[PDB]
Amino acid sequence: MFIGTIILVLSFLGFVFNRRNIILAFICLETMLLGINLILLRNSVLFDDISGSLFAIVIIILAGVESAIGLSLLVSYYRLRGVINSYGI
Amino acid sequence: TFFHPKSREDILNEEAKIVQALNNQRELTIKMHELKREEKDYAHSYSPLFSDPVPQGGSIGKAPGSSRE
Amino acid sequence: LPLVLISLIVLTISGLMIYSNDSILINKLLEAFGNDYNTIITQDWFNIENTTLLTTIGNVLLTNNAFILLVLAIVLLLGIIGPISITMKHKE
Amino acid sequence: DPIPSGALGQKVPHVDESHQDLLFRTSHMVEDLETYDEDSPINTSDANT
Amino acid sequence: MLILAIISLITFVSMSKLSDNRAIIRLINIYLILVLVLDSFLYLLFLNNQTYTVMGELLIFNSFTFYIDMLIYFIMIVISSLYGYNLYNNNLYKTLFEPKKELIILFLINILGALLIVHSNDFITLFVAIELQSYSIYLITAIYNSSYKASKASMLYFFMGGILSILIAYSINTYYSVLNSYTLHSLDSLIINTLDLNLILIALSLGLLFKIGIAPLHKWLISIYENTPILITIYISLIPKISILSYLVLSNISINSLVISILAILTLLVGSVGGLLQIKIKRLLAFSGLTNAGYMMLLLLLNNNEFSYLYYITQYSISHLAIFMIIIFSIYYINYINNQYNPIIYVNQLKGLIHDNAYLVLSMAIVVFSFIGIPPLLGFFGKLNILMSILNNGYYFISIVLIVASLISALYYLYLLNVSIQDKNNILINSNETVSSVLSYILSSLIILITFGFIYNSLIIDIFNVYFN
Amino acid sequence: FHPYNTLGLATQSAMVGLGAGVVAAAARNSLATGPRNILTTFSKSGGVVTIFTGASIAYVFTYCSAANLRERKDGWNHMWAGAATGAVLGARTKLVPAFIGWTVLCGAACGLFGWTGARFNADRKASLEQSPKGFVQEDAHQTFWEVVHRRPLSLTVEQLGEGRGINAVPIATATEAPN
Amino acid sequence: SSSTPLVKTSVNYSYGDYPLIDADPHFKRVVGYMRPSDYGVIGLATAALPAGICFAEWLDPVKGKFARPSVKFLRVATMLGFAVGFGAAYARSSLRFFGVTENAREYKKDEAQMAARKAAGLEPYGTSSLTPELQEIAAKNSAHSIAGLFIFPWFNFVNHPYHGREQK
Amino acid sequence: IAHHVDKGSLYRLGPVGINRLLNKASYNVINLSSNTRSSLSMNSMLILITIVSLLLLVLVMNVNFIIVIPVLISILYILFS
Amino acid sequence: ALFTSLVGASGLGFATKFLSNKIRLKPAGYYPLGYVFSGVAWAGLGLVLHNVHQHSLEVLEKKKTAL
Ligand SMILES: CCCCCCCCCCCCCCCCCC(=O)OC[C@H](COP(=O)(O)OCCN)OC(=O)CCCCCCCCCCCCCCCCC
Ligand SMILES: CCCCCCCCCCCCCCCCCC(=O)OC[C@H](COP(=O)(O)OCCN)OC(=O)CCCCCCCCCCCCCCCCC
Ligand SMILES: CCCCCCCCCCCCCCCCCC(=O)OC[C@H](COP(=O)(O)OCCN)OC(=O)CCCCCCCCCCCCCCCCC
Ligand SMILES: CCCCCCCCCCCC(=O)OC[C@H](COP(=O)(O)OCC[N+](C)(C)C)OC(=O)CCCCCCCCCCC
Ligand SMILES: CCCCCCCCCCCCO[C@H]1O[C@H](CO)[C@@H](O[C@H]2O[C@@H](CO)[C@H](O)[C@H](O)[C@@H]2O)[C@H](O)[C@H]1O
């Protein structure tokens, strides 16, 4: 409950206050999902329940597919522009 | 002579019939506003077939002593 | 820095107060900071099999929640089919 | 007579091929009243060729 | 039926060249029509609001969801005819509006994600379906990768939609941490009063609502609808809003929220005010979609909101298609083409359209006055029902803000009509090319419904008083 | 009614308005264009701090004061508070007429906001849905939302007043012949 | 192997104005009880889809000139049209079972089928390969799934005992 | 009368004044997402501001509601001035 | 009534065909058979709503009868 909230908050703040590049944005998204899964698995242990672990495995699947789609979209941007500059999207 | 109006009586009856039907629609409207926002049954709301809300859980380590009422 | 600090404090205290059901605000956080007491672990004898978490996940995911599995298949179809459409130019 | 006006009576720019030039890039008008295309066939003529 | 469509199309499209894409779109168009005709009798199951739970307790099927399903299909048989029937058989209109190979698959997958949301009964199905609807619509924005603006658009929409999926999952995991449940049926008057879940559920509503452009995070979605191609803008702008608003209406989460009241007020003000200086069409119509999202947000606070929502979402969708269709037809009669993807950008390019095609402007006026809420057009009977519900439940300041927002929005809605009925030199006198038959008949049918569908209002009320009561 | 505490609420309101000024200052320093730093927050900010503090002070001070002077709780108080707030905000533009206009129109809007109940929410029990409605049954007092076929005459004479055609007894029966 | 319910259900719930037969009918009974109206609707959709694209090509051809669509699209057209027709007929029969439409002939056929099975000693609705808990899970997954026919197809194949009739 | 009222204050409380009022308010609404240099960090900062503002606004209006009102008047000024 | 409904729904259908012809900048009498097709199609739609409403009125009447 602590570690997950902390990674989530710090990664949201590093997503919001990133004036540098974009890979930090991808990373902060993945870390936010990680912290969520840790919150949920801690609660699932304390309750001795399974719905939490089910939603966790589902998050892992969905996050991996998220990164796949995001890194195809980036490749499209790069196709057209040739450089992913610090302040472009 | 060419003045051939409908009588007073037939006019009053027709207006009364109209007002009666309008009052009928009024009562139907109130009655439906009441029929909605009235509590229903679980079967009409969630599940006609498995109408027992009570959740039976897993079975792989069913512990006698875990049922309760 | 000022916005980073304000956002840090508020988001942390809210993310901690949120998990509790007390009505007074300050007590919602002082409940989160109550990690003081140990949890007893008793041993029973009702579990008969060698079911672990992965077996349970398979059982519920493939019986009770089959629909989500048969939708994740389509999420993965998107993971295949979108990146192709984006990267691969079907000029022919 | 015709000078293009807006929903509020404000002045509006008449868009042509005139201001897709390289002179009107690198300005900081908002996304609403910018008028630079970036995808016109005047700028994207030599495009990944 | 969607699934067998999506499954069959994958094989049938991989087996098929780039030259069959229009015919394949036409096929799935007719197939969806046959579904909507032949399987529509299933509305009988929902007599007396008999509600069904399916796949355990993951899905829920009632008259609300079924009507939304028919509407999404009616939208998806009109949005497909726009890709599968060429307007004019000219080289320009071949280059301007040509479908890609994978587009139709992504449309149907987005239909599926839309329907899994409204039909959801558990948060797990919601999270899986909103990710499906979200990922499919990242790709739809990005499929036209030969444009710079669309590339920028998909990237921003990915990041700012990912952030909101994080917010949604954080809210769900909090609800589960509190209550050990993923199902909202496990709430009731006792549990609402007894537990402090207000924060935990508004965070759900906001994480869903900021994905549809609710203020003050409207700008990013407006930049997207402007920067993307027009025939994609007409889909992305509508279907995601229907799905998420319908899920939030069906689940009576935010009965009397103060935060929602504030934000909905801000949407009506922003979407009415900020759209006045706009010279571009798509930003104008996006701010219009925002203020209508404000009006429809105002019935998340009611607990009896089905009729008002269903009537407004239907006329909104119809007017939204019809106006974008008028803008598409008018490309023939303008003088300057701005792009291969957005041939028409500025409102001042529709000048003199009355002197070219007048009945296109008649349709534009009917549709505009429908947006404004002029009777006897359907928009009146839709905004009337909203006013009845909010005044019946105790929102008065918001009704005044609603009236004020309608007046302010008349101005950016009438900008189109004013420039259209203006005069122009170099008029059209003859043209041997002719627009397609189907797209004309579709536009006409939407116009005739916006105009004359007030005739059936009692009949709709009777059917509603049976199947929804 | 129960009186208001003017200074207690005003001090809370001022600290709140100062805090909101700090938040908006930092948010502007982050969202702004040109080279900035941690110094610019309170230098280059367009009076967000004094805006928020003066408004919250003037609004709450005037509402509690006029609630205590009028000795009531109603919408006229919120009108006076919006009138003060419009003065403060319009003093920034250094013109008399815009100051008067900002005052009157901010006052009318807050005064309407107090008329409708001084809330963006709803009461949810004073509303028509959750309250008695329709025709009252048998001679019972007519509430707000209730409808009546025939009203008492004493209640009419009190709510309206006598004269201008409206009287305690009808005119014919009053002038009937005692025969 | 016991085929005895684990969880209570409703007895003779009325989904419509007419009586009930089954609430989760097996695919076999739904296909064997089909009226000719259902097979005609199958062939109606089977012919109406390819005819629909021919009608459309007549209205707005794909090029400048009318040409009849290629047999490739016609074949795929016929397959999907049979699928639409079967889904409609599987629904029309299922609703005759639920009690939403006229179900006289289906009532009598089930009363005859069931009495014959009781005479032969067979379990009504049959015997299964599964444990009863999976039977209940199957009925919970598969009951009233035809309401989702616009989205997905789902079908009962398990021979569970949780049909919505009295114990006998 | 004809000038100072019929064509003066009564156009100011109407077409002329509402036009000027909306000219500014629209030009301040849209000049909010100021820099197009990077649309991402800006909308991201807008998320953080809104979340923080709602958490703090709800905090204030739990304890007292007649104090948050001027906070909202001033916010509307900041957004529309 | 049924017949009044069908003529009206056909009247909307002629308006769709006419408005479609005009949007194409054709004469109103371009392809007359389209008037007949639009008539029967919308007539079927009005007929469907006619039967839906009839079934619903019967249902509420049946509710009163079983009372
Ligand atoms: C997603 C990206 C990943 C990052 C995630 C970051 C963590 C997320 C934090 C939580 C989720 C975000 C919530 C978004 C804001 C909206 C919250 C909300 O609207 O809930 C309001 C709700 C009451 O509203 P309502 O139900 O509508 O009306 C009835 C009122 N009785 O319920 C409430 O009443 C709210 C409860 C009031 C207490 C709020 C807690 C504030 C405490 C902060 C104190 C800070 C200390 C002072 C200042 C420090 C600076 C020096
Ligand atoms: C730290 C110590 C804490 C102490 C405890 C008490 C703290 C209370 C704090 C209260 C909240 C203060 C938040 C202040 C608002 C955020 C500041 C801001 O600048 O908002 C606007 C923001 C940036 O705009 P800016 O860079 O200044 O450029 C202006 C040019 N237009 O751009 C944005 O888009 C963000 C907008 C955020 C809006 C939040 C939601 C407000 C809801 C509007 C209310 C409308 C209701 C009234 C309607 C009446 C109808 C007539
Ligand atoms: C809980 C309480 C909440 C209740 C709401 C309280 C209301 C608070 C309102 C404050 C929020 C900020 C909005 C203020 C308006 C924004 C623009 C402005 O500041 O007004 C000035 C404008 C300037 O006119 P001018 O002097 O000619 O131009 C030079 C300006 N530097 O002025 C003019 O154009 C001339 C004004 C003439 C008077 C016109 C009166 C019209 C009244 C009907 C308004 C209806 C439209 C409402 C618009 C809403 C916009 C937010
Ligand atoms: C449904 C397709 C929508 C696609 C868009 C086309 C509009 C069709 C509206 C018919 C709705 C209905 O007839 O139904 C009435 C519904 C509930 O009835 P139901 O349970 O859904 O049964 C319907 C069974 N059908 C599908 C076989 C017929 O009441 C409502 O709240 C709907 C409010 C909609 C207002 C829009 C009016 C538009 C004018 C229509 C002139 C023909
Ligand atoms: C411009 C026209 C449209 C503008 C929109 C507003 C129209 C709607 C009317 C607002 C009605 C407000 O009415 C609200 O206050 C009245 C008192 O006056 C209250 O009425 C109640 O007041 C109490 C006294 O406090 C008395 O017992 C009274 O008999 C009644 O029960 C209700 O709690 C509520 O109905």
Q: E463 CA distance to ligand 4 centroid (A)? A: 9
Nearest to E246 by CA among E211, E171, E297, E290: E297
Report the residue of C5, C8, C10 to disrupt the H interface, i.e. the one with the largest count of H CBs within 10 Å. C10
CB count within 10 Å of CB E387 equals 18
Are chains I and H in touch, 3+ Cβ pairs below 8 Å? no
Q: Which of E217, E220, E273 sits opposite H29 (nearest CB)?
A: E273
List the chains bordering chain F where 3 or more Cβ pairs fall under 8 Å. Answer: C, E, H
Chains touching chain I, criterion 3+ CB pairs below 8 Å: E
Q: Is the peptide bond before D4 cis (omega within 30 degrees of 0)?
A: no
Report the b/e string of F125-160 with b at 16+ CB within 10 A.
eebebeeebeeeeeeeeeeeeeeeeeeeeeeeeeee
Domain positions in chain G? 1-168
Q: How far apart are CA F19 and CA F21, in angstroms?
A: 5
The ligand 2 atom at the shortest distance from the C-alpha of residue C6 is 1
Does E460 sit in the ligand 4 pocket, CB within 6 Å? yes
Q: Considering only CA atoms, which of A5, A41, A4, C18 is closest in space to residue E178?
A: C18
Distance E153 CA to ligand 3 centre (A): 34
**Residue of B50, B52, B56, B60 for testing the chain G interface, max G β-carbons within 10 Å:** B50
Give the distance (Å) from ligand 5 centre to CA of residue F113. 15
C-alpha–C-alpha distance, residues H24 and H43, integer Å: 23
Contact flag for C and B (3+ C-beta pairs < 8 Å) = yes
Question: What angle do the packed helices C66-87 and E103-118 form, to 10 degrees?
Answer: 150
* Best E44, E326, E445, E452 residue to mutate vs chain I (most I CBs within 10 Å): E445
Q: Does A67 touch chain E (CB under 8 A)?
A: no
* Å from CA of A42 to ligand 1 middle: 23
Chain E: residue nearest C67 by CA? E55
Most A CBs within 10 A among H33, H39, H40, hence the mutation to make, goes to: H40
**Count of Cβ atoms closer than 10 Å to residue I66 Cβ:** 6
> Is there an atom of ligand 2 within 6 Å of F26 CB?
no
H66 closest CA partner among E255, F77, F84, E261: F77
The tally of domains found in chain E comes to: 1
* Chains E and A in direct contact, meaning 3 or more beta-carbon pairs closer than 8 angstroms: yes
Q: What residue spans of E421-453 are helical by DSSP H?
A: 437-452
H-type alpha helices, chain F: 6-31, 48-69, 75-91, 96-115, 153-160, 171-174
Whole-angstrom distance, CA of residue E457 vs CA of residue E441: 24
Q: Give the mutation target among E36, E242, E463 for probing the ligand 4 site: most ligand atoms within 8 A of CB.
A: E463
Element (DSSP H or E) covering residue E54: strand E52-54
Q: Which residue has the tokens 């295949």?
A: C80
What residues of chain F lie within 8 A of the CB of H65, using their CB?
A: 119
DSSP code at position F146: E
CA dist G62 and G73 (Å) reads: 13
Q: Do A36 and E170 touch (CB under 8 A)?
A: yes
How close is the Cα of E462 to the center of ligand 4, in Å? 11
| Chain E nearest CA to I50, separation (Å) | 9
Ligand 4 midpoint to CA E456 (Å): 10
If you ran DSSP here, which 8-state letter would residue F41 be given? G
- Nearest chain E alpha carbon to B50: E53
Amino acid at E390: I
State the method.
cryo-EM
Cα–Cα distance measured from residue E74 to residue E32, given in angstroms and rounded to the nearest whole number: 8
Amino acid at E363: S
Give the nearest ligand 1 atom to E201 CA: 20
Please give the C-alpha separations between residue H63 and each of C13, C25, E380, H60, H67, in angstroms, as whole numbers: 17, 10, 41, 6, 9
The atom of ligand 1 lying closest to the CA of E166 is: 1
Whether residue A68 contacts residue C85, with contact meaning beta carbons closer than 8 Å, is answered with: no
C-alpha atoms less than 13 angstroms from C-alpha of E215 in its C-beta half-sphere: 32
State the Cα torsion F164-F170-F172-F173 to the nearest 10°.
-150
Which positions in chain E have a beta carbon within 8 angstroms of at least one beta carbon in chain H?
Answer: 152, 155-156, 159-160, 163, 199, 206, 210, 216-217, 219-220, 223, 258-259, 262, 269-270, 273-277, 408
DSSP D12-28: -PPP-STTSSTTSSS--
Tell me the best of I6, I10, I38, I49 to mutate to test the pocket of ligand 4, counting ligand atoms within 8 Å of each CB and taking the most. I49
Question: Please, are residues A52 and A43 in contact by the beta-carbon 8 Å criterion?
Answer: yes
Closest CB to A89: pick one of E128, E135, E152: E152
Does ligand 1 have an atom closer than 6 angstroms to the CB of H34?
no
- Any alpha helices (H) in E274-396, and if so which ranges? 281-297, 306-329, 353-356, 358-372, 378-393
Domain interval for residue B22: 1-69
Which mutation among E238, E314, E386, E455 tests ligand 4's pocket best, with the greatest number of atoms within 8 A of CB?
Answer: E314
* Ligand 3 geometric centre to CA of A38 (Å): 49
Distance of CA E127 to the CA centre of its chain: 20
Contacts of C18 in chain E (CB under 8 A): 174, 199-200, 203
Q: For residue G32, which amino acid is it?
A: G
Amino acid at B24: N
The resolution of the experimental structure, rounded to one decimal in Å, is: 3.7
For chain G, first and last CA: distance in Å? 19
Residues 6+ apart with CB under 8 A from B50: G7, G8, G9, G140, G143, G162
Whether E204 is in the pocket of ligand 1, judged by its Cβ within 6 Å, is: no
User: How many structural domains is chain B composed of?
Assistant: 1
Query: The tokens 């028409």 sit on which residue?
Result: E344
The CA distances from residue E366 to E314, E370, E422, E449, in Å, are 16, 6, 17, 10
Omega before B53 within 30 of 0, i.e. cis: no
- Amino acid (1-letter code) at residue E341: Y
Which residues on chain E are in Cβ contact (under 8 Å) with B34? none
Nearest CA to ligand 3 atom 18: H81
Burial G146-159 (b: 16+ CB within 10 A, else e): bbbbbbbbbebebb
Q: What angle do CA E76, E81, E82 make, to 5 degrees?
A: 100
- CB contact set of F47 (below 8 Å; sequence gap of 6+): F92
Do H and D touch (≥3 CB pairs < 8 Å)? yes
Residue F112 and residue E400 in contact, taking contact as beta carbons nearer than 8 Å: yes
Cβ–Cβ < 8 Å for G145, G23: no
H34 at interface of D, judged by CB pairs closer than 8 A: yes
Q: B22, E89, A32: which is closest to A40 by C-alpha?
A: A32
Question: What does DSSP say about strands F134-135 and F146-147: parallel, antiparallel, or unpaired?
Answer: parallel
Specify the residue with its C-alpha closest to ligand 3, atom 1. Answer: H69
Report yes or no: A37 and A3 within 8 Å, Cβ to Cβ. no
- Whole-angstrom Cα distance, residue A86 to residue H37? 10
Which residues in chain H have their CB less than 8 angstroms from residue A10's CB?
none
Are F122 and E395 within 8 A, CB to CB?
yes
Task: Name the residue of chain E whose CA is nearest to G55's CA.
Answer: E30
